[PDB]
């Protein structure tokens, strides 16, 4: 998830 990785 980008909300986790970014």
């Amino acid at each position: 998830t980008g909300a986790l990785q970014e």
Partner: antibody
Amino acid sequence: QVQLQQSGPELVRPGASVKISCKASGYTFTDYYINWVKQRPGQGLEWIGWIFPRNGNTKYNEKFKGKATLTVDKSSSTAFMQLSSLTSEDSAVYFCATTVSYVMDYWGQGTTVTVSS
Amino acid sequence: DIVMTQAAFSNPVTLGTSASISCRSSKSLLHSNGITYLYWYLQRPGQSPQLLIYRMSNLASGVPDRFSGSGSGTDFALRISRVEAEDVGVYYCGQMLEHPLTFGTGTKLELKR
């Protein structure tokens, strides 16, 4: 400066298992997720899962149940993905993509695993 | 699992012209934070993917200005101002909203002959 060097081309026999490497350089390896994707000539890009180098946390895509196992070697800034019990359905290219600023903004070379007897 | 549907090939594009590639997601990609997590990746023949657009409409440093990205809810589109030969390859859209991350079949950008 940021580069991901994946392992080379692999030819494996059905049944066997393969470990693909993805050595990182150019950024602090431990703080960024590394994604693994699978691309078969007749499909799109299928997401295998990711691993967080620092604490080795890991999440998989159900479809890559007990097929793929992601591991990390902090001391080589290297990540590995191991596919076990190989079948011709596993013949594909396997990328490793880290998310430095935005999701998978840095891609690996795209090794090519071929399973045949 | 969220599903992403793309066409196999884009409408033929005469060089220098303009072009757009579509992509629909089986569910809204908007997140509590207001960011729509749809991403765009291009794969030029004989190369690794490259991130082009992130969060629906943002350009990734390095990408040309003639690459824009928009969308309405579950419908998105990548637009190429003036297509250059170098822009040929297969375009994949990807939903980074929830696990598992999933992409579209990718769309091959064909040229008009």
